[PDB]
Design a protein around this ligand. Structure first.
Ligand SMILES: Cc1cc2nc3c(=O)[nH]c(=O)nc-3n(C[C@H](O)[C@H](O)[C@H](O)COP(=O)(O)O)c2cc1C
Ligand SMILES: Cc1cc2nc3c(=O)[nH]c(=O)nc-3n(C[C@H](O)[C@H](O)[C@H](O)COP(=O)(O)O)c2cc1C
Ligand SMILES: CCOC(=O)/C(=N\O)C(=O)CC
Ligand SMILES: CCOC(=O)/C(=N\O)C(=O)CC
Ligand SMILES: CCOC(=O)/C(=N\O)C(=O)CC
Ligand SMILES: [Cl-]
Ligand SMILES: [Cl-]
Lengths: 360, 360
């Protein structure tokens, strides 16, 4: 089974090709994770996945999506991740973390508490920042403040500090969150970036924030640990061919800048889109990015059955299959996939106190 | 669905009829549980089961099965359980504990490390005790030391102390381990009990250790929390009709002694048996105990599919369905069962950070 072959990138070896992608839990308080996260992450790591990327973790307080989002904007915030790192490693999985800034989608309610922008009367909210003073729309109507040059320098340094803290906390894999309509994605997209300075307009200028942030993080992130990013390569906004071509060129510049793997996603920059949701629907797009930019990739959004994950690897569409919601349903999903694909000694995907009895 | 109806016993209300039976993890050190257990138990409790009975926990060091077994023979051992108790409760499940003494089956290797009696050359072994100096045989050939009346008094007091410690740790449900061929079962069975004093021979005498231990525990266990026991009611040794009749009479005496629920199991007192393993094969035996002793029951050993669990409840065979190995495979099995049985808003079997996404 291709799904259960190990994968080596820089000095890190994953025991299989199953990655748990970042999934916000909305259970932190003042950015600090707690017993929710400790058990959540440890249980999934014991389930057998080879890589576990911790949820979007804000580089600055205003970069959280919600009041429940994790943060890493202080050393004390970073130290709270140490037992999560330890538990993931103890289970034989590789600990990664996604560092993030929500941009104009920030200051929102938890998804089961309205999922919309916090009203201006509500003291839980905060002012959001973005390349330009333009609202997402729909359920996110708040207009962000357009960033100053000093804001751009500060946020870049916040990403550096977050990567420094993630390194010192023992993470072995980092993912810059440049996707899903948050700050980095919104610098790249012409929908959201109307700047007239060095950070908007041309392709070079719209790329600048992402390339400079990658370069700044590269200075503090160890050479021997994978440096990755998530990036929305099309929007399904009727501009897909032109957008994909530009996104793939940016991926080439990421590779020149030391990026080791690209998590290929959808932009979600604006609500006026027509996304063709379906099983493994990102497969062909990830394959094109992988082949044309000559960069290893992962993707998600419907690969969460064992046969779909296996097929995507054999078709050379992905190097790692990211399986999200199936791991919320069943934290031992990797063991379920091993059984379904007929792996030999499939129960030993799990630690001995489970594996011994499930082999029978 | 009957499986998802709440259940009230004394002052305790379980949110459904799914119980997780005690399952030894063999991961403790010198009786102290650790982060293996913390994550293991918290994850299963978040999975939705209404009751979680913690694994066989030894009332005395020589009452462990293996060097990996949990213990509660000191106050420090009991304090180690407090975070487990509190995590189970935080998940909305009810924390129980089975307190145990392995008798002649003690001083054994972990199941994935030979599963047999520890060799006399090995620095990990200890002297075992039992009603009579007779070995189990097979992979457990060590001859135990026959208990004196002083030993009987001491072991009873060890159960009392363990119950008091479980109470102060916050457990809301206790199970005395009188099953599976360990100390309590071995006093009841004529196979292992050849005593000639007040604790062997007649039915009254063979029952005496179990009834006296129950009565001693009842003095310190709160009247408003369920007091239960697990008991092997037959052996599949060619003596089943007489043995089950005696076992059911003992259940009547347990009820008169204040027992609130019986976990009905197989004796496993000797190796020379022919157990007819099959799906829900204990159903009819548990039904007979429940009806004839007029006492609530649970049972296990093959009820771990949603339809079998539902059928057993609808047939009035059980009051709670214990589902063990299926929760090792999938800590969220209760959610899987709610989906299979078509429960309304089945995903909200799980906490919101999972439920919100699995609904859609
Ligand atoms: C609860 C939840 C939280 C998510 N949080 C993040 C996140 O923090 N960062 C991110 O890039 N994507 C996030 N996403 C997207 C997932 O990483 C993934 O792409 C998505 O679940 C699709 O994969 P799946 O079909 O296997 O679930 C989240 C998705 C869910 C359901
Ligand atoms: C790993 C494991 C540990 C067990 N530990 C205990 C125990 O500590 N006490 C006990 O009474 N039974 C124990 N048993 C029996 C279970 O409680 C249960 O009766 C058995 O797993 C059958 O139910 P199932 O078919 O749902 O797995 C254990 C079983 C397993 C597989
Ligand atoms: C078809 C709709 O496209 C738009 O008007 C747009 N950007 O171009 C926005 O949504 C602003 C948030
Ligand atoms: C619209 C797609 O957005 C996501 O997948 C997501 N949460 O749902 C994140 O990226 C949180 C940082
Ligand atoms: C074969 C019957 O014995 C059991 O189920 C068991 N572990 O497997 C225990 O009771 C541990 C105390
Ligand atoms: Cl751990
Ligand atoms: Cl429930």
């Amino acid at each position: 089974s291709a799904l259960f072959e190990p994968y080596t990138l820089k000095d890190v070896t994953l025991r299989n090709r199953i990655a748990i992608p970042p999934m916000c839990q909305y259970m932190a308080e003042d950015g600090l994770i707690n017993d929710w996260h400790q058990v959540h992450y440890a249980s999934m790591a014991r389930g057998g996945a080879g890589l576990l990327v911790v949820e979007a973790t804000a580089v600055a307080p205003e970069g959280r999506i919600t009041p429940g989002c994790a943060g890493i904007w202080s050393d004390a915030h970073a130290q709270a991740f140490v037992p999560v790192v330890q538990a993931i490693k103890a289970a034989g999985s590789v600990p990664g973390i996604q560092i993030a800034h929500a941009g104009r989608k920030a200051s929102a309610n938890r998804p089961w508490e309205g999922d919309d922008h916090i009203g201006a009367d509500d003291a839980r909210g905060w002012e959001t920042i973005a390349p330009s003073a333009i609202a997402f729309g729909a359920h996110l109507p708040n207009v962000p403040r357009a960033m100053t040059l000093d804001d751009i320098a500060r946020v870049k340094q916040d990403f550096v500090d977050a990567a420094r803290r993630a390194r010192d906390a023992g993470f072995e894999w980092i993912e810059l969150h440049f996707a899903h309509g948050y700050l980095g994605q919104s610098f790249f997209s012409e929908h959201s970036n109307k700047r007239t300075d060095a950070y908007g307009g041309s392709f070079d200028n719209r790329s600048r924030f992402l390339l400079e942030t990658l370069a700044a993080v590269r200075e503090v992130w160890p050479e021997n640990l994978p440096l990755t990013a998530r990036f929305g390569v099309l929007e399904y906004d009727g501009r897909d061919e032109q957008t994909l071509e530009e996104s793939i060129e940016l991926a080439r510049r990421f590779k020149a800048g030391g990026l080791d793997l690209l998590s290929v996603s959808v932009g979600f920059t604006i609500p006026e889109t027509n996304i063709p949701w379906g099983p493994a629907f990102m497969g062909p797009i990830a394959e094109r990015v992988r082949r044309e930019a000559k960069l290893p990739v992962t993707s998600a959004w419907g690969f969460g059955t064992p046969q779909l994950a296996e097929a995507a690897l054999q078709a050379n569409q992905l190097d790692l299959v990211s399986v999200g919601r199936a791991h919320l349903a069943d934290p031992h999903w990797a063991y379920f996939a091993a059984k379904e694909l007929g792996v030999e000694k499939a129960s030993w995907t799990l630690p001995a106190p489970y594996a011994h009895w499930l082999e029978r």
